[PDB]
């Protein structure tokens, strides 16, 4: 790699480590915000559009219920998510603006991206052209180069976690499975269609799982459906471990070749995990038209700009039952979340 890249990544790691070793804590409180609308909801948390009452800025506030985090065995994952997010800085990662906790919940207040999830746009349009898929893929390649250099594995790449911003660029959201790992890690996590074989087979796995997931994402963007579909998880898993993938005839030869090397079941042969690391991907013919520096600098005109009316528009997100943000009169799970 050019010394220019080496020096960039050295500074990136220095800055990450300073924040990693001394995390920010308790930088706002709930009553600084008005609640606007629920943007998503899951088994232990929700994301809400909020507005800061003094500045008028909009934010996406992720709210995690401490008791449900404990019950679903997500303590370390939630601590990872916040400690990582407060320490990273890259053009394609959503920014954490504030965090805090109260008697009941953990809160991460992030920039709000009104363009919505890539998933919605992909399903609406059907499939992206190769140039369009490639534009997004290049951003993920650079993001993973950054994260992996910091010893971070992302572990949740999928279209729902990629928001489209006002310039048409990606912002990765949801660091719930991200982890700082020197070497291997073992937790079963991630969505079935995106899991690498070594996760399915309960092995100690490493950053190569993110490169596998990039193969899945590129396939899904370009085809409109993922490479290993089925009705039950076990049937998906059988397909993933099999070493077989079929490509639509509309895929270019270069696309197929790249995908065979990302969707390589043998992790020791998978692109991104060889001696040349990320450069085997960056130098692949499918990326021959990609100006990597221009992508990083956000100088490339994007394939499309989501339609939205302004920073408070929620039209690109869907509608959920609006539930209370209740805060117990008694502290819950204080010990478990001391460091948050």
Ligand X SMILES: C[N+](C)(C)C[C@H](O)CC(=O)O
Task: Give the residue ranges of the annotated binding site for ATP.
Answer: 39-47, 62, 111-117, 158-161
Site size toward ligand X (CB under 6 A) is 6
Q: Are 59 and 52 in contact (CB under 8 A)?
A: yes
Stretch in the footprint of ligand X (CB under 6 A) among 52-60, 81-89, 91-99, 131-139 = 52-60
The residue among 163, 162, 153 whose CA lies nearest residue 84 is 153
User: Rounded CA gap, 340 and 335, in Å?
Assistant: 10
**Which of 1, 17, 18, 56 touches ligand X by CB under 6 A?**
56
Q: How far is CA 293 from CA 60, 129, 220, in A?
A: 29, 22, 25
Site for ligand X in 290-329 (CB under 6 A): 311-312
Measured from the CB atom, the residue of 28 and 300 that comes closer to ligand X is: 28
Our finding on whether 233 is near ligand X (CB under 6 A) is no
| Contact (CB, 8 A) for 65 and 57 | no
Angstrom distance (rounded) from CA 154 to CA 159: 14
The structure tokens listed for 246 are 């079929």
Dihedral pair phi/psi, residue 205, rounded to 5°: -120, 170
CB-nearest residue to ligand X? 56
What track of x and - describes contact with ligand X for positions 82 through 111 (by CB under 6 A)? ------------------------------
State whether residue 335 is helix, strand or coil: coil
Which of residues 9, 25, 40, 57 is near ligand X by CB under 6 A?
57
Q: How far is the CB of 58 from ligand X (least distance, A)?
A: 4
Q: What are phi and psi of 6, to 5 degrees?
A: -60, -45
In the set 31, 65, 151, 156, the catalytic residue is: 156
Shortest Å distance, C-beta 170 to ligand X = 19
Looking at the Cβ atoms of 109 and 214, the one nearer to ligand X is 109
Among 2, 4, 55, 202, binds ligand X (CB under 6 A): 55
Do the beta carbons of residue 190 and residue 240 sit within 8 Å? no
Binding mask 9-48 for ligand X (x = CB under 6 A): ----------------------------------------
110 in Cβ contact with 43 (< 8 Å): no
Q: What phi and psi values does residue 23 have, to the nearest 5 degrees? A: -70, 150
Question: Is 156 a catalytic site residue?
Answer: yes
Give the residue with the Cβ less far from ligand X, 33 or 107.
Answer: 33
Span near ligand X by CB under 6 A; candidates 56-64, 119-127, 144-152, 281-289 = 56-64
Contacts of 235 (CB under 8 A, 6+ apart): none
**Min dist. Cβ of residue 169 to ligand X (A):** 17
b/e per residue 88-125 (b: at least 16 CB within 10 A)? bebbbbbebbbbbbbebbbbbbbbbbbbbbbebbbeee
Looking at the Cβ atoms of 91 and 312, the one nearer to ligand X is: 312
Taking the complex as a whole, the smallest distance from the CB of residue 97 to ligand X amounts, in Å, to: 10
Binding-site member from 58, 101, 148, 155 for ligand X (CB under 6 A): 58
Q: How far is the CB of 53 from ligand X (least distance, A)?
A: 11
Which residue lies nearer to ligand X by CB, 55 or 249?
A: 55
Specify the residue, 303 or 312, whose C-beta has the smaller distance to ligand X. Answer: 312
Spatial CB neighbours of 110, under 8 Å, sequence gap ≥ 6: 59, 60, 61, 62, 85, 94, 95, 96, 97, 173
Strand-pairing partners, residue 115, are none
Q: How far is the CB of 327 from ligand X (least distance, A)?
A: 25
In contact, 219 and 208? CB cutoff 8 Å: no
Return d(Cα 108, Cα 81) in angstroms, integer: 9
Stretch that binds ligand X, among 54-62, 87-95, 154-162, 258-266 (CB under 6 A): 54-62
Q: Catalytic residues, which ones?
A: 156
Interface ranges with ligand X (CB under 6 A)? 55-58, 311-312
């Amino acid at each position: 790699e050019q010394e220019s890249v080496k020096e960039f990544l050295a500074k990136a790691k220095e800055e990450f480590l300073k924040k990693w070793e001394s995390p920010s804590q308790n930088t706002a409180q709930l009553d600084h915000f008005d609640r606007i609308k629920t943007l998503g909801t899951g088994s232990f948390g929700r994301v809400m559009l909020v507005k800061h009452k003094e500045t008028g800025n909009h934010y996406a506030m992720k709210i995690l219920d401490k008791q449900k985090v404990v019950k679903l065995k997500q303590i370390e994952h939630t601590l990872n998510e916040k400690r990582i997010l407060q320490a990273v800085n890259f053009p394609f990662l959503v920014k954490l603006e504030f965090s805090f906790k109260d008697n009941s919940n953990l809160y991460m207040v992030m920039e709000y991206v009104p363009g919505g999830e890539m998933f919605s746009h992909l399903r609406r349009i059907g499939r992206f052209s190769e140039p369009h898929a490639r534009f997004y893929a290049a951003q993920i390649v650079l993001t993973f180069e950054y994260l992996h250099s910091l010893d971070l594995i992302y572990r949740d790449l999928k279209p729902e976690n990629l928001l489209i911003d006002q310039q048409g660029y990606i912002q990765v959201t949801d660091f719930g499975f991200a982890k700082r790992v020197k070497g291997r890690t073992w937790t079963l996590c991630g969505t079935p269609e995106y899991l690498a074989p070594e996760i399915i087979l309960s092995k100690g796995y490493n950053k190569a799982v993110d490169w596998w997931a990039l193969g899945v994402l590129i396939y899904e963007m370009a085809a409109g459906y993922p490479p290993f579909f089925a009705d039950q998880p076990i049937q998906i898993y059988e397909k993933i471990v099999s070493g077989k993938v079929r490509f639509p005839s509309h895929f270019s030869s270069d696309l197929k070749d790249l995908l065979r090397n990302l969707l390589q079941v043998d992790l020791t042969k998978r692109f991104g995990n060889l001696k040349n690391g990320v450069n085997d991907i960056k130098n692949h013919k499918w990326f021959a038209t990609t100006d990597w520096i221009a992508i990083y600098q956000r100088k490339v005109e994007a394939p499309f700009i989501p339609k939205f009316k302004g920073p408070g528009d929620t039209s690109n997100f869907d509608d959920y039952e609006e539930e209370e943000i209740r805060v117990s009169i008694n502290e819950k799970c204080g010990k478990e979340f001391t460091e948050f």
